[PDB]
Amino acid sequence: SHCKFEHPRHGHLGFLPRKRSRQIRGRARAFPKDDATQKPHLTSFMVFKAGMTHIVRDVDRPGSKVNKKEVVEPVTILEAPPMVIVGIVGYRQTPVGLKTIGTVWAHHTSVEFRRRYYKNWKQSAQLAFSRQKQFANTKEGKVAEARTLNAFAKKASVIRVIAHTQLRKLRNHRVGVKKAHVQEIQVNGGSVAAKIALAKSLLEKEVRVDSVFQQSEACDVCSVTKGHGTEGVVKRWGVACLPRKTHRGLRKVACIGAWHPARVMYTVARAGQHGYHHRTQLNKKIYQIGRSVAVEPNQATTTYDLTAKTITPMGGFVGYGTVRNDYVMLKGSVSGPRRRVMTLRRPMAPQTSRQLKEKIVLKFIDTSSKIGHGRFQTKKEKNQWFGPLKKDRIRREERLRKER
Amino acid sequence: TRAGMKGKVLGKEKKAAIIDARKKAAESRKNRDDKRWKRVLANMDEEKRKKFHGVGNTAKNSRVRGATRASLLKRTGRKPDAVSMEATIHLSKLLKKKTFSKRAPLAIKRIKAFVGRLMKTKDNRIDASLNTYIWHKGVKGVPGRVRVLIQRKSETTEGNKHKHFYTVISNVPVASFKGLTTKTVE
RNA sequence: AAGUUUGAAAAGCACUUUGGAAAGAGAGUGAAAUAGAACCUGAAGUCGUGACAAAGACAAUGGAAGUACCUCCAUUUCAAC
RNA sequence: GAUGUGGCCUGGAGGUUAGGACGAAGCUUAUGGCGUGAGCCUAAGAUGGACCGGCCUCUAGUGCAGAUCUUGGUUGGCGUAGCAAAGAUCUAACGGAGAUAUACUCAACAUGCAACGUUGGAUACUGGAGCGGGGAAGGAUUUCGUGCCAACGGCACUCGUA
RNA sequence: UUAAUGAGAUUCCCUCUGUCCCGAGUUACUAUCUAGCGAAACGACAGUCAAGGGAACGGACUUGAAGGGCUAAGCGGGGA
RNA sequence: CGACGUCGCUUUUUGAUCCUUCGAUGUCGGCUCUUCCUAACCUAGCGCCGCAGAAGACGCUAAGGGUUGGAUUGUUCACCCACUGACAGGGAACGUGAGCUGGGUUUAGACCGUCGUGAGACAGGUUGGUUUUACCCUACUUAGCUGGAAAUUGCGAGAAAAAGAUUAUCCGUGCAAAGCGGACGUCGGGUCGCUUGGGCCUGGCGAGCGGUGGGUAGUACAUGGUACGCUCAUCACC
RNA sequence: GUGGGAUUGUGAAGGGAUCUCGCAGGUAUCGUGAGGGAAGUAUGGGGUAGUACGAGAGGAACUCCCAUGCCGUGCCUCUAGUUUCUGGGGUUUGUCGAACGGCAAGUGCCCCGAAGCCAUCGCACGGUGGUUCUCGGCUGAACGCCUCUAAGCCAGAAGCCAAUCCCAAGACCAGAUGCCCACU
RNA sequence: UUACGUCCCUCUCCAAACGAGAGAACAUGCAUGGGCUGGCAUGAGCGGCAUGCUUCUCCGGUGGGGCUCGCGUCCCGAGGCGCUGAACCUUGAGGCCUGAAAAUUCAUGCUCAGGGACACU
RNA sequence: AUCGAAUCGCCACCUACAAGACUGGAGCUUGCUCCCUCGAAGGCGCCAAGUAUAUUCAUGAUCACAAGACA
Ligand SMILES: [K+]
Ligand SMILES: [K+]
Ligand SMILES: [K+]
Ligand SMILES: [K+]
Ligand SMILES: [K+]
Ligand SMILES: [K+]
Ligand SMILES: [K+]
Ligand SMILES: [K+]
Ligand SMILES: [K+]
Ligand SMILES: [K+]
Ligand SMILES: [K+]
Ligand SMILES: [K+]
Ligand SMILES: [K+]
Ligand SMILES: [K+]
Ligand SMILES: [K+]
Ligand SMILES: [K+]
Ligand SMILES: [Mg+2]
Ligand SMILES: [Mg+2]
Ligand SMILES: [Mg+2]
Ligand SMILES: [Mg+2]
Ligand SMILES: [Mg+2]
Ligand SMILES: [Mg+2]
Ligand SMILES: [Mg+2]
Ligand SMILES: [Mg+2]
Ligand SMILES: [Mg+2]
Ligand SMILES: [Mg+2]
Ligand SMILES: [Mg+2]
Ligand SMILES: [Mg+2]
Ligand SMILES: [Mg+2]
Ligand SMILES: [Mg+2]
Ligand SMILES: [Mg+2]
Ligand SMILES: [Mg+2]
Ligand SMILES: [Mg+2]
Ligand SMILES: [Mg+2]
Ligand SMILES: [Mg+2]
Ligand SMILES: [Mg+2]
Ligand SMILES: [Mg+2]
Ligand SMILES: [Mg+2]
Ligand SMILES: [Mg+2]
Ligand SMILES: [Mg+2]
Ligand SMILES: [Mg+2]
Ligand SMILES: [Mg+2]
Ligand SMILES: [Mg+2]
Ligand SMILES: [Mg+2]
Ligand SMILES: [Mg+2]
Ligand SMILES: [Mg+2]
Ligand SMILES: [Mg+2]
Ligand SMILES: [Mg+2]
Ligand SMILES: [Mg+2]
Ligand SMILES: [Mg+2]
Ligand SMILES: [Mg+2]
Ligand SMILES: [Mg+2]
Ligand SMILES: [Mg+2]
Ligand SMILES: [Mg+2]
Ligand SMILES: [Mg+2]
Ligand SMILES: [Mg+2]
Ligand SMILES: [Mg+2]
Ligand SMILES: [Mg+2]
Ligand SMILES: [Mg+2]
Ligand SMILES: [Mg+2]
Ligand SMILES: [Mg+2]
Ligand SMILES: [Mg+2]
Ligand SMILES: [Mg+2]
Ligand SMILES: [Mg+2]
Ligand SMILES: [Mg+2]
Ligand SMILES: [Mg+2]
Ligand SMILES: [Mg+2]
Ligand SMILES: [Mg+2]
Ligand SMILES: [Mg+2]
Ligand SMILES: [Mg+2]
Ligand SMILES: [Mg+2]
Ligand SMILES: [Mg+2]
Ligand SMILES: [Mg+2]
Ligand SMILES: [Mg+2]
Ligand code: NA
Ligand code: NA
Ligand code: NA
Ligand code: NA
Ligand code: NA
Ligand code: NA
Ligand code: NA
Ligand code: NA
């Protein structure tokens, strides 16, 4: 008989199966549609999630009740050290899909990138790319490289570059990994020859996040969500708990199927892996593209709040540390825990809405301690409130007498 | 380890020669970079040198940029078979949220594992003073910190092919744990 | 419930060696020890092991025809037979 | 369902004719041969150790695949469910075969683990309506000492009401 | 008819609350992994489906669609 | 919209039948959860009206999505209050009890009415009344190992490849053009047979493109660590 | 050919013969995407506008703008919840002679409480094109006229398909690569 | 059947029931301390016209009651004040700092040929 | 290198394309006439590198997987 009352089904059947992701890193399953009338440019970048804070800004949206008013919006900080381009790959169309034509490697490759080919680099022979380096720059090597580049010019419809992160530049004590994360970055815009020219000029060179994304733009995030291991139907699917009287347990689905079909359907909620799934999240507005603190210390200082502060809150980002490189400040949240590597992609959805076209100007960036209820914005403000303490007096008098 | 790095496969002479050659190569590469950075900073003017701060090992309270801390560490060779150390153990950081009835027994196990890793020993004996200190506030009132004297000895039984080492761990009464580091005592 | 029904005779395994012991490995007795002790004969079912045969997923088995390989089986033939 | 069968097979009896220590019965089979078939016969045993085959007649407790059939044994499930009330044990020394048990390399960790009885310490429990000290009913040597670890005390024991 | 009495049956109100809106976090013991020990129920044979006919509701059949093998933790649709 | 008539469909009602199940297929309702159907309540379009507008009637294509909170009743059903864009109808063993719940129905206790001489009876009322087992196989949910195209073998040769002394006998460029641009030499030895300045291995000198290591200068890049000039030593092509 | 094994039932030590197997692949990245899954949905306000329409009474809609319900996927900056960090305090009875330090009451109890986890109880995000239906039309015969239809075309639905999104080579990728080894 | 290499033991936690995963491979790797950030809310001890506290000589310095001693003193007394935003805790299932600058922005210790198995008829 | 195998047509002239209500080409008379290469062949290969002056074939004994096979 028909169900007594109707309610929408629990969960999205299009995110199936709810299994552990193949890779910890975010990977773009598709790139934004290529438009040849534009200049050649990179379509993606790799960042590291540092932490979260919130900002204050004025909304410019006529007809809204918050127009010309201040709002508080949570933001996510992601450290973005420069990427290094080491390879060029070309793709040609076939009736069975895209095929790689070849790979042009940079003549000199970083130790970081070569560590990705090993499980124990420190105890290994460290011979990666040694034969390739010797073969290159020879008469046969130069002809082979020209052969591959001409094959790209003649047959390739898609040109992508091979880029790796710099864990040495990301001087983080909690990430642990020292082998570089490697991803293919598509080159969109222009002709194939123009794409090849840009890729060649980018070989062995560094790429900054400000060269791929602008300040007030929006972007897509490819990342893997936080893991939770085995989880019951209540948390994994959001099914309602059974009454307290239920014998043998109440965190279950009562009926997992009718008599016929004499089977359990794939649409029924079951216990299993929750989290650690790859997600592509749309329309994450970039609120700030900050430079390295070593280049400009005042990262969280605005024209409205003139306090000299960095993006790192007092006490550091919990479990991450200090943001020491360039960073991207995205409105809202992104999938995945801190320290996880993530892929920022140029948006694939249309960017014509007023919200997506609004120019973002920040008036306040919170830098209070994320441990406890932070009530100070800077070290100086805390010292002004407390004044001299017992430890400070002991230190100052010892320096005055014993050392001066 | 891999076959190409095993001590038995290569032998002592080959392993030592490869290790020494690797260290000498690291020394020379660091020397090149030190010389280049010294030269480049010397030519560099005041304005651009103010940007390039900390590079040529100029700053204070900084690491050495050209190597690892482990490489610069001084190797004084094998420690003697008998050696005594005084060390603090942060027990609360290991016993957090443990079952209350198991805290004192687990703390004994954790201390034994802590010493065993330090001294490469499986025979770690707990002196009565240490056992009393761990248990003196009940099974669930283990102190958050302990100061222990670790004495390694060697005593093998006749016929054994490999020499036997063991440690005796005893309590060191302290009025305060602040400012105490690991020491090698006699 | 339960035939002590080992062998003709206890000749019921000295002695060596390993093992804390049980026992193992040797060595002996006897026509026979795979007759070693409540021991004649020792089936079926089930299991271990070595060798080999292969085999996707048609549950397996079965029928009829061949073929590949094997065969301590049978029979025939080996000279103008 | 009926009937027939110089039709097959089993235990025993009356006759007859043979076999067996140079191996009877029984048992085993990629041992083949014969018979439409029930079955019969040979071969091999690196199986067995003393009985036994064929033919005519007589005779009967005479032929099994299954009766939630009887008895005995086995077996997948399966090293699986589990062995979670009565809170809790730690440490050193001694005792013990129960170890600190190692081809080569090799300093010890990464190659003998785990678990014990007693004594001294430590921590806790029973909380006098007691895992305190004595009796009836019931049990009948469980009492005590020495020895002892095969089986038993659903883990373990060097301990035991074994 | 009935004061008092009731682990008796019923209705409402105050108080109260995770009964619920709507779920979340924590603990001990389990499950889970290991050492030792070690069962029972059950067991024609077996075990992917759709339709078709069929003792009128198939794991075996007809015709199609699936199906590489072996495993760990769950689960209660089927095994009428 | 449709009397008198008449022709059908449906199995979301009851009945008729007794084919399956009596060495047992757990029998009401609700909760929970998934899926299917369309005779379409809302939502997307579109005709038509006794469609001025607004509000509506009827009809078409369409089941992608949605279709509620409560009072009384064990109830399905019914009724009322309220929200809403709307509160459409159904199926899945009258979906779903080794998923729950146990109010009802259907034991044994007991009360009432009616019936019976009586023991007792009543789709009449009432109150109280044990809801067992998964560790097997599939299914589903996740989680590991690992072969394999003759889907384990055949040696059983098929490229979404190149384009030539039959892919051998150079490399670029060009349209499977016409052409055009380039290529390390030299002096010996040894071995085998399209005889073509033959194939192969190998030695001594001199170049070139390079790799690695040392020295040395400016410069770039996130600024400790790479690259680039010049110069030595060495290895490789050889 | 070459290498490693096996011939295991009534002896030992040796020679043959015959069988079975190995003889080129390993290991590490970047990708392709067949197939399968598949998601967004709905309302209100502003404005249109007291306009169109209507004697009056009454009285709409699209572009555009701002919000919200349901659902989906995350996230922990804030706020709220949760404490066996028994963190720091308080406080009861007992207890080590008191104090200190504690301890027992299966976390004694009370207040505050980081980290973590977590609530539409908090915050973020949720997109592009086609093929057709019904229907309205164009051209246009059959049938000199007529006619969306007969041959041809146009426009065209929350359906359907693909993009985007999730798993992804038993889909056996002669896709591209890094190091050895093998062949040479 | 030689090398590259992979796995087990070890260490870390973005992973996790067990496998698996991400990493590390003498590495500020780990350990302890220091500082930071944060929590609690002023430790123990001693003292009140100093001999103590605070500031560079001027400041501050209790208590309802009660008990001895010929007015005074010296004793009991919850609580109060001072040293004292003090004492303690702060990474652990796993906060920050040894790489921007700082009237502190980090020190020290441990390792001494990593072991084992495959790869390899 | 096990390895003995089953397969028995080669090409650098087919290995380009499209139309069968009509693609060899014209004329006007529109189904006939005229012109042409006459609208019904991809090239070779099948035993003298070429159609002749020739030339070793056995006894592998009359079929047997061709006893060989780089065209
Ligand atoms: K029904
Ligand atoms: K229902
Ligand atoms: K715990
Ligand atoms: K029968
Ligand atoms: K079993
Ligand atoms: K006695
Ligand atoms: K026993
Ligand atoms: K009473
Ligand atoms: K079938
Ligand atoms: K029910
Ligand atoms: K009764
Ligand atoms: K009751
Ligand atoms: K809070
Ligand atoms: K919290
Ligand atoms: K209590
Ligand atoms: K609280
Ligand atoms: Mg997690
Ligand atoms: Mg219950
Ligand atoms: Mg119950
Ligand atoms: Mg850190
Ligand atoms: Mg925080
Ligand atoms: Mg806060
Ligand atoms: Mg015998
Ligand atoms: Mg074979
Ligand atoms: Mg056969
Ligand atoms: Mg008889
Ligand atoms: Mg047999
Ligand atoms: Mg009988
Ligand atoms: Mg029988
Ligand atoms: Mg178990
Ligand atoms: Mg247990
Ligand atoms: Mg218990
Ligand atoms: Mg139990
Ligand atoms: Mg040892
Ligand atoms: Mg031991
Ligand atoms: Mg007590
Ligand atoms: Mg008593
Ligand atoms: Mg006794
Ligand atoms: Mg036992
Ligand atoms: Mg009562
Ligand atoms: Mg059965
Ligand atoms: Mg079926
Ligand atoms: Mg069946
Ligand atoms: Mg079932
Ligand atoms: Mg009518
Ligand atoms: Mg019947
Ligand atoms: Mg029945
Ligand atoms: Mg039955
Ligand atoms: Mg059933
Ligand atoms: Mg319809
Ligand atoms: Mg619909
Ligand atoms: Mg639907
Ligand atoms: Mg029905
Ligand atoms: Mg039903
Ligand atoms: Mg039930
Ligand atoms: Mg059921
Ligand atoms: Mg009831
Ligand atoms: Mg009732
Ligand atoms: Mg009745
Ligand atoms: Mg094969
Ligand atoms: Mg083949
Ligand atoms: Mg698809
Ligand atoms: Mg505390
Ligand atoms: Mg306590
Ligand atoms: Mg006590
Ligand atoms: Mg939520
Ligand atoms: Mg039309
Ligand atoms: Mg459409
Ligand atoms: Mg793949
Ligand atoms: Mg104090
Ligand atoms: Mg204070
Ligand atoms: Mg502090
Ligand atoms: Mg600094
Ligand atoms: Mg042949
Ligand atoms: Na048997
Ligand atoms: Na066997
Ligand atoms: Na049927
Ligand atoms: Na019936
Ligand atoms: Na409508
Ligand atoms: Na679909
Ligand atoms: Na409006
Ligand atoms: Na017309």
Side-chain angles (χ1 to χ4, degrees), chain A residues 1-63 65-352 354-397 399 402-404, chain B residues 1-44 46 48-186:
Chain A
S1 46
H2 68 91
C3 62
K4 198 71 178 323
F5 306 100
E6 309 268 358
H7 71 83
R9 67 149 293 119
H10 297 288
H12 198 306
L13 295 169
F15 292 90
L16 284 190
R18 296 273 203 66
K19 69 184 300 301
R20 292 166 196 176
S21 172
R22 197 180 52 95
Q23 314 163 304
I24 192 175
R25 64 167 165 119
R27 188 187 33 90
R29 272 80 161 135
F31 293 98
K33 188 200 276 124
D34 190 9
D35 168 39
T37 49
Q38 303 222 261
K39 288 174 65 259
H41 56 274
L42 305 186
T43 58
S44 88
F45 202 85
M46 269 177 129
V47 296
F48 293 87
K49 183 183 168 156
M52 272 192 99
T53 176
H54 60 273
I55 60 95
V56 174
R57 66 165 192 107
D58 278 314
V59 177
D60 175 19
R61 175 172 47 230
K65 272 146 82 126
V66 298
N67 186 54
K68 282 144 152 56
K69 323 259 215 171
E70 268 158 7
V71 294
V72 167
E73 296 178 328
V75 292
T76 299
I77 307 294
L78 306 109
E79 199 164 351
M83 286 183 107
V84 176
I85 308 302
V86 292
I88 310 170
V89 291
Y91 287 89
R92 64 189 193 91
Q93 294 172 282
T94 75
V96 298
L98 276 169
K99 313 293 279 305
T100 310
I101 299 169
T103 301
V104 169
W105 288 116
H107 296 299
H108 312 96
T109 56
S110 165
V111 163
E112 265 146 341
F113 171 71
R114 281 182 280 131
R115 287 179 83 133
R116 180 51 66 171
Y117 289 86
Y118 293 83
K119 262 25 189 278
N120 188 353
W121 162 265
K122 290 303 298 297
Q123 280 176 29
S124 72
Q126 304 175 2
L127 288 183
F129 282 86
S130 60
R131 294 311 201 64
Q132 199 274 336
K133 182 170 210 181
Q134 275 174 288
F135 172 68
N137 298 346
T138 66
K139 315 306 263 219
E140 296 90 297
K142 290 150 160 15
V143 171
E145 178 183 301
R147 221 209 299 300
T148 305
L149 292 171
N150 187 226
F152 293 170
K154 264 135 187 312
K155 319 224 173 161
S157 60
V158 169
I159 301 294
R160 306 211 193 118
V161 293
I162 303 180
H164 71 87
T165 52
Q166 293 190 114
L167 277 313
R168 278 195 305 222
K169 259 63 164 57
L170 186 101
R171 270 162 265 283
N172 192 270
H173 318 289
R174 307 301 316 268
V175 290
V177 55
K178 293 177 185 175
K179 43 165 80 151
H181 311 99
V182 181
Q183 77 167 358
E184 282 186 23
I185 305 178
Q186 195 159 283
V187 183
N188 274 359
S191 67
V192 167
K195 289 180 180 137
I196 287 159
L198 170 75
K200 267 175 109 273
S201 85
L202 279 181
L203 270 186
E204 236 172 291
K205 252 56 164 288
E206 285 189 304
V207 173
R208 277 177 128 251
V209 71
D210 73 1
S211 77
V212 185
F213 289 101
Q214 255 153 54
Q215 189 264 328
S216 211
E217 292 184 317
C219 78
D220 303 352
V221 175
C222 300
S223 52
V224 178
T225 66
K226 298 179 71 173
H228 305 305
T230 309
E231 201 45 84
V233 294
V234 169
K235 277 212 188 19
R236 209 198 186 202
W237 298 99
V239 312
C241 301
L242 302 169
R244 185 210 43 98
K245 271 213 210 183
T246 320
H247 176 57
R248 278 189 220 112
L250 49 91
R251 290 180 77 79
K252 313 174 173 190
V253 167
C255 174
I256 63 168
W259 194 320
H260 282 105
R263 264 159 292 147
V264 180
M265 290 207 246
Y266 79 104
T267 54
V268 181
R270 317 280 286 158
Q273 166 77 27
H274 190 224
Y276 198 74
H277 309 306
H278 187 271
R279 295 296 184 253
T280 304
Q281 315 129 76
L282 289 203
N283 296 340
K284 306 293 186 166
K285 282 268 288 195
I286 306 171
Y287 271 11
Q288 186 185 39
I289 304 210
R291 291 257 258 137
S292 280
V293 62
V295 176
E296 188 22 62
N298 305 6
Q299 309 179 294
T301 304
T302 67
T303 66
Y304 311 79
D305 180 25
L306 295 177
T307 314
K309 26 198 262 183
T310 80
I311 204 61
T312 305
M314 305 150 63
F317 279 109
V318 181
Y320 185 82
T322 309
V323 174
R324 311 142 149 93
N325 297 86
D326 303 348
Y327 63 94
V328 179
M329 180 212 262
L330 296 186
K331 170 200 191 213
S333 57
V334 306
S335 297
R338 67 220 175 180
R339 308 162 202 166
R340 194 156 289 172
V341 63
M342 293 159 186
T343 289
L344 261 50
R345 189 186 64 189
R346 285 198 80 77
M348 200 126 54
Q351 304 303 299
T352 61
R354 291 200 176 180
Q355 309 48 45
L356 289 177
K357 299 170 44 136
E358 190 191 7
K359 159 87 187 144
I360 302 306
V361 173
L362 308 180
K363 318 167 67 180
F364 177 79
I365 305 176
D366 190 86
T367 54
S368 73
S369 173
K370 300 315 181 243
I371 301 157
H373 302 297
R375 46 179 286 242
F376 304 111
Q377 289 304 310
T378 59
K379 308 294 216 93
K380 198 247 222 188
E381 183 190 347
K382 177 172 179 175
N383 292 333
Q384 180 57 57
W385 172 275
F386 276 94
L389 292 169
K390 177 175 174 176
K391 260 174 82 213
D392 302 303
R393 304 193 280 111
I394 277 177
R395 195 156 47 191
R396 169 205 42 67
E397 95 196 52
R399 181 263 315 284
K402 329 301 177 310
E403 308 322 302
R404 296 193 312 193
Chain B
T1 70
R2 44 182 277 244
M5 206 216 201
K6 282 197 189 304
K8 43 164 39 181
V9 171
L10 299 189
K12 190 38 208 143
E13 68 295 289
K14 295 263 262 283
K15 194 74 171 299
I18 271 161
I19 274 153
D20 290 359
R22 178 174 48 128
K23 288 196 55 190
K24 298 314 158 192
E27 163 267 352
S28 59
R29 179 58 127 121
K30 184 223 254 175
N31 277 272
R32 235 154 56 201
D33 274 290
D34 286 302
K35 264 138 64 154
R36 174 179 68 74
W37 270 121
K38 185 142 181 322
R39 197 216 326 149
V40 160
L41 290 167
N43 315 313
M44 221 192 279
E46 270 308 301
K48 210 203 260 229
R49 224 190 274 102
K50 271 128 52 202
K51 289 151 84 123
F52 283 80
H53 175 80
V55 181
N57 291 307
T58 66
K60 65 218 214 313
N61 315 128
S62 274
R63 83 181 181 83
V64 177
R65 294 269 177 128
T68 67
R69 198 176 67 116
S71 70
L72 305 175
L73 191 41
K74 218 45 91 175
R75 303 303 178 124
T76 333
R78 219 143 270 167
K79 253 151 173 87
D81 285 334
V83 52
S84 291
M85 327 175 135
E86 273 183 20
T88 297
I89 304 170
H90 195 183
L91 289 175
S92 47
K93 104 179 202 178
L94 314 169
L95 298 180
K96 181 183 186 181
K97 279 172 65 74
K98 286 303 181 182
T99 307
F100 282 144
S101 67
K102 304 179 174 178
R103 276 191 184 235
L106 288 166
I108 295 293
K109 283 168 178 275
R110 288 298 182 282
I111 291 169
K112 290 173 75 275
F114 176 98
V115 169
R117 277 188 290 289
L118 207 48
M119 292 296 214
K120 315 293 200 307
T121 42
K122 294 298 193 182
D123 190 16
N124 308 298
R125 325 205 171 140
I126 303 285
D127 176 64
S129 71
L130 177 50
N131 199 67
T132 301
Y133 178 83
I134 293 310
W135 279 89
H136 86 274
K137 286 159 66 182
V139 73
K140 68 179 98 83
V142 182
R145 273 159 165 101
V146 62
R147 187 82 174 162
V148 290
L149 175 71
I150 305 156
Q151 300 173 294
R152 194 176 61 183
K153 304 195 241 313
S154 38
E155 178 149 347
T156 326
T157 80
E158 290 306 305
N160 297 150
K161 340 284 291 209
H162 296 254
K163 154 152 46 188
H164 185 66
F165 292 87
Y166 71 96
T167 63
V168 172
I169 322 161
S170 56
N171 187 56
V172 174
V174 291
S176 152
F177 289 97
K178 322 202 86 63
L180 296 183
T181 55
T182 308
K183 300 293 186 61
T184 292
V185 302
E186 287 81 6

